[PDB]
Point group: C3
Chain length 247, copies 3
């Protein structure tokens, strides 16, 4: 046989490139996943991830309470933190023993898989009682924020999209929902009657994951890298596996 | 300039009326929210609110367990109350230390924002094992109860709609789901293919809120009134902010 | 009057047969329920049931954590079991005091009501971090497994459909979502614009139930049999109430 890496008959090499190209492009097909991660960063260095993976479209909806840090199997002062909630839903509305709950997220990162169409991304960053803009009567139920999403580039390939905002001020008390639609460069509407009920089933079939990792390093090692997820750390370092046309 | 409140050139006055009219009418546009509140009233005077705010349509789905009172950070006798559940799912099916759990709701109030079309309201008030009418084989999955919803009037304006039923008997052990569709006087179907996928995204983007307030007074002060929500208290007093054509 | 059970004028008998036939056939109408049960079997003999009942379509979505056994009001070693989760999300990723968590399900049974169309059944049996097939880039978000569903026959009538798989190996660490569509032998698309928004409302109105029964016998007695649900026990015994054309 020919010698490896010297001719057009390195079929092992051509198969390896095809395998990676097929995965990248299958992800972008109508049969592929679109994936959303919401990372909540806490002052103790830990990071809650909410992940959802689904066909056609994907979303995550959180309230002020559900984004707060919960240390499973450790002391979370649940009564005091319920009083924090009362005091955050309405000024001077509770009696916690603290000015600022360290369970409040300090930052949110939203990451989409590269199979999303950024023009469809919608976000409702609301107040602590789950109103998009102060009062329901004046509230558009979402903002289209795709123009703020940064590309996560690795080796010249877009491995994901990131929107990141900090919550450093005492009044950064939020509720959060995010939604994005899978790429569809075709004119075949996936939610038109020929396929509409499969989009309803995709709502049933969406797989959700949640975990609080002890720090960004551990998140990077045992979640992002282990499962070929895109990521952007606090030092602006990009993570991901470039696939298209690549060995 | 002209003197305030004497002529047609009080632009400050005309702007104030426009601002309120715009909020009222924006809420009723296809871009606006439709909002649902389910209030569960407990014998100790406290009130659980489940709220959801979303575009196009909105809903809440609860089971018998999820409506029971949970005092966050206090003793809830979780083992005994699990035995209550077993004894409520099937007669003589458990061994709690009590005949009637005081965590069982005594009443439900359903309130919709004025942007709902009452003809679309649907409710599945089921039994304790989440069957609409005793057995699945005979169950229509909802009842259309819009004709029972009372208008919450303030200053002549409908600020919301209310359906209220008490659960005073020992056999009032329910599961509950409610759904309502936003007003659409146009013939443009918001869930037809031109816009269907935005309705799927509205399912992702719906913002949810839940809290147990210690009494109706506190609910009225720090939730209803603070955020311009409609309400109807036990004394048939109406709460809300009239907006259309108003300063 | 005629004597009972001797002539065509036993209207009591004809009414009884009609009543049962009407229930069976109403369940199969577009107005009827389609119901899904996911049973998680634990090594201590207890069984978690997740049930959802809804019109048009129905689904359940679980992750690795949410399928684990939780003994309400008893000791569940929450910190140790969080370390199990970390160690199951990534090999050698945690420090629990145990090799195998007895909270891990040993088997899953999926049961649909007889009103499902098995050709629409979809399942995403994913890994412990909620990926269908190891990596998102290669993942079809579901498998169509209807050909594996066994009919639950009683007295010659299909009272339900069952898919059962064991999780006996240490690497059987799963996430699970299931979806099925109600029968529609007509060509009237229930999710076409004439009725699409009612399918969105059915997403709001779906009633959910969850309980952990102490053993299969108790499940059979106080859940399956009490509410005329189909079931298949470990000894291949079928449970259900045949209805069509029957007294
Ligand atoms: N493209 C390129 N890569 C370089 C160069 N010098 C060092 N490298 C490294 O080599 C890597 C790319 O090697 P290859 O993937 O085999 O080259 P390629 O440009 O992708 O060409 P093909 O894959 O054969 O189509 C890059 O990631 C660089 O880190 C250079 O001059 N050009
Ligand atoms: N309409 C009306 N309001 C009265 C009358 N007497 C006292 N009021 C009070 O005045 C309030 C209404 O005042 P306005 O809003 O300025 O009057 P309006 O009828 O709404 O007329 P415009 O707002 O200027 O279109 C009501 O809420 C009443 O409580 C009365 O005779 N007619
Ligand atoms: N069909 C049938 N059932 C039998 C026979 N022998 C005993 N059985 C029992 O009788 C039951 C059926 O009785 P029926 O329901 O009154 O008879 P059927 O065949 O359903 O006829 P109809 O209901 O009158 O239309 C079955 O469940 C059997 O357990 C037999 O020879 N034929
Ligand atoms: N030294 C080099 N000279 C020429 N081309 C390179 C070199 N290094 C990488 N490339 C090519 O440039 C393209 C982008 O690679 P590059 O490493 O710049 O992406 P990147 O990971 O986004 O870089 P960075 O993260 O440093 O901004 C790839 O196709 C790669 O093959
Ligand atoms: N004394 C009054 N004389 C004439 N019109 C009034 C008077 N008070 C209010 N109105 C007008 O009547 C309309 C309805 O006001 P009203 O206060 O009756 O509503 P409401 O809050 O539902 O009343 P209630 O709660 O007492 O039944 C409004 O347009 C208001 O301007
Ligand atoms: N001994 C019998 N002779 C003739 N027909 C019977 C007899 N027993 C039942 N049948 C009829 O056969 C049909 C199927 O009944 P059968 O009891 O076999 O269903 P099944 O419950 O699935 O049986 P099994 O669970 O034992 O496999 C029914 O219509 C019933 O009336
Ligand atoms: Cl495709
Ligand atoms: Cl509009
Ligand atoms: Cl029908
Ligand atoms: Mg290359
Ligand atoms: Mg006025
Ligand atoms: Mg018979």
């Amino acid at each position: 046989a020919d010698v490896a890496g010297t001719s057009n008959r390195d079929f092992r090499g051509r198969e390896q490139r095809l395998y990676n190209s097929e995965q990248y492009n299958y992800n972008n097909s109508l049969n592929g996943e679109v994936s959303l991660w919401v990372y909540a960063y806490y002052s103790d260095g830990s990071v809650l991830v909410r992940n959802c993976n689904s066909q056609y479209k994907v979303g995550i909806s959180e309230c002020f309470k559900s984004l707060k840090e919960v240390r499973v199997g450790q002391n979370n002062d649940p009564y005091d933190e319920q009083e924090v909630n009362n005091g955050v839903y309405y000024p001077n509305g509770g009696e916690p023993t603290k000015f600022h709950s360290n369970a409040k997220p300090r930052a949110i990162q939203i990451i989409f898989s590269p199979s999303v169409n950024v023009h469809t991304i919608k976000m409702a960053k609301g107040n602590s009682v789950s109103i998009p803009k102060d009062y329901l009567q004046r509230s558009h139920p979402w903002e289209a924020t795709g123009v703020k999403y940064r590309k996560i580039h690795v080796d010249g390939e877009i491995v994901g999209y990131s929107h990141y905002f900090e919550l450093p001020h005492e009044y950064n008390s939020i509720s959060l929902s995010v939604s994005g639609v899978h790429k569809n460069p075709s004119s075949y509407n996936v939610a038109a009657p020929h396929n509409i009920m499969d989009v309803f089933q995709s709502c049933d079939l969406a797989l959700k994951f949640s975990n609080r990792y002890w720090c960004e390093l551990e998140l990077i090692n045992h979640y992002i890298s282990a499962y070929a997820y895109p990521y952007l750390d606090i030092n602006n370092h990009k993570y991901g596996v470039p696939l298209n046309g690549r060995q």
